[PDB]
């Protein structure tokens, strides 16, 4: 119904630039104020900035840690919100989400003054796009089966090894399988690369197929690996 979808996240060199996009749908975009917020690995949410609606001036406000380097703009004709990031620093690394703000409607009462009245708020979010500010290069993961060993229920899975940067996404049987699925937070190896595992519990072996669908957007790598015993 009501949704925001951000894209543009990826690896960028320190001192570089990157532009994020946020596409809205299901509501009158031009009527609302919008924000950009970010969350660094294992840290709290941090507000990046806001942009007012055209009717309220279309002006911007920025957090002191980004003002001067980051620029927020909107294109009401495309229902798109932008975040232009320049002079990127390693500390700018985080998952960036767009959110809505003080929504405003213009109504004319039988008399004259057509009021512009406001409502709340910071309602619609995410899912966020990942921005990595680092020197090191990209690397897709190697996917290995964690086969259903005999050593009631059985556990099987996929090992997603040595990738960079975060994140990777794992689904099973194109998302048809969610029950008994546990995808673990990635661990950071001595090598400087990440690795994670996704495992599923099941009764039935041989009757059905189990395929993990791994996606590493940063390196444009997609892997479908069937796990057989």
Partner 1 sequence: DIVMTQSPLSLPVTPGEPASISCRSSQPLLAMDGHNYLDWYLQKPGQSPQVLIYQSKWRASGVPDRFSGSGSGTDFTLKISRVEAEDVGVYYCMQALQTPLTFGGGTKVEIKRTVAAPSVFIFPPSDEQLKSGTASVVCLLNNFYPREAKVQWKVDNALQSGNSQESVTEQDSKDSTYSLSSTLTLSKADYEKHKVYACEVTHQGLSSPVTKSFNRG
Nearer to partner 1, 92 or 101 (CB): 101
Q: Which stretch binds partner 1 (CB under 8 A): 69-77, 86-94, 189-197, 213-221?
A: 189-197
- Min separation Cβ 213 and partner 1, Å: 16
The residue among 8, 4, 9 whose CA lies nearest residue 166 is 9
**Interface pick for partner 1 out of 9, 104, 128, 140 (rule CB under 8 A):** 128
Nearer to partner 1, 112 or 117 (CB): 117
Q: Which positions from 39 through 68 interact with partner 1, judged by CB under 8 A?
A: 44-47, 50, 61, 63-64
- Min separation Cβ 12 and partner 1, Å: 22
Tokens representing 169 are 């996404």
Which conformational region is residue 25 in: left (phi greater than 0), alpha (psi within -120 to 50 degrees), or beta? beta
Please tell me whether residue 153 binds partner 1 under the rule CB under 8 A.
yes
Determine the distance from the C-alpha atom of residue 59 to the mean position of all C-alpha atoms in its chain, rounded to a whole number.
26
Nearer to partner 1, 46 or 106 (CB): 46
The residue among 66, 98, 63, 61 whose CA lies nearest residue 79 is 98
What counts of helices (H) and strands (E) characterise the chain? 0, 19
**Interface pick for partner 1 out of 21, 69, 138, 144 (rule CB under 8 A):** 144
- Min separation Cβ 50 and partner 1, Å: 7
Following DSSP, what letter does each residue of 131-194 receive, concatenated? Answer: EEE-SS--BPPEEEEE-------EEEEEEEEEEBSS--EEEEGGGTB-TTEEEPPPEEPTTS-E
Determine the distance from the C-alpha atom of residue 13 to the mean position of all C-alpha atoms in its chain, rounded to a whole number.
20
Please tell me whether residue 185 binds partner 1 under the rule CB under 8 A.
yes
Please tell me whether residue 123 binds partner 1 under the rule CB under 8 A.
yes
**What residues line the site for partner 1 (CB under 8 A)?**
35, 44-47, 50, 61, 63-64, 97, 101, 120-123, 125-128, 142, 144-147, 149, 151, 153, 155, 157, 159, 161, 182, 184-187, 189, 195-197, 199, 201
């Amino acid at each position: 119904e009501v949704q925001l979808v951000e894209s543009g996240g990826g690896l960028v060199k320190p001192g570089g630039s990157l532009r994020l996009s946020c596409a809205a749908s299901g509501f009158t975009f031009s009527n609302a104020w919008m924000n950009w917020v970010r969350q660094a690995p294992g840290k709290g949410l941090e507000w990046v900035g806001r942009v007012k609606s055209k009717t309220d001036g279309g002006a911007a406000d920025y957090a002191a840690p980004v003002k001067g380097r980051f620029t927020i703009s909107r294109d009401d004709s495309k229902n798109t919100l932008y975040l232009q990031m320049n002079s990127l620093k390693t500390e700018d690394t985080a998952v960036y989400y767009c959110t809505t703000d003080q929504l405003g409607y213009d109504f004319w009462n039988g008399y004259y003054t057509d009021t512009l009245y406001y409502y709340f708020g910071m309602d619609v979010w995410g899912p966020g796009t990942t921005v990595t500010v680092s020197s090191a290069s990209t690397k897709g993961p190697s996917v290995f089966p964690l086969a259903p060993s005999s050593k009631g229920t059985a556990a099987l899975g996929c090992l997603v090894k040595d990738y960079f940067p975060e994140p990777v996404t794992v689904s099973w049987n194109s998302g048809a399988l969610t029950s008994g699925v546990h995808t673990f937070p990635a661990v950071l190896q001595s090598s400087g690369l990440y690795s994670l595992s996704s495992v599923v519990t099941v009764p039935s072996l041989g009757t059905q197929t189990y395929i993990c669908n791994v996606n590493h957007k940063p390196s444009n790598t997609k892997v479908d690996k069937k796990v057989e015993p």
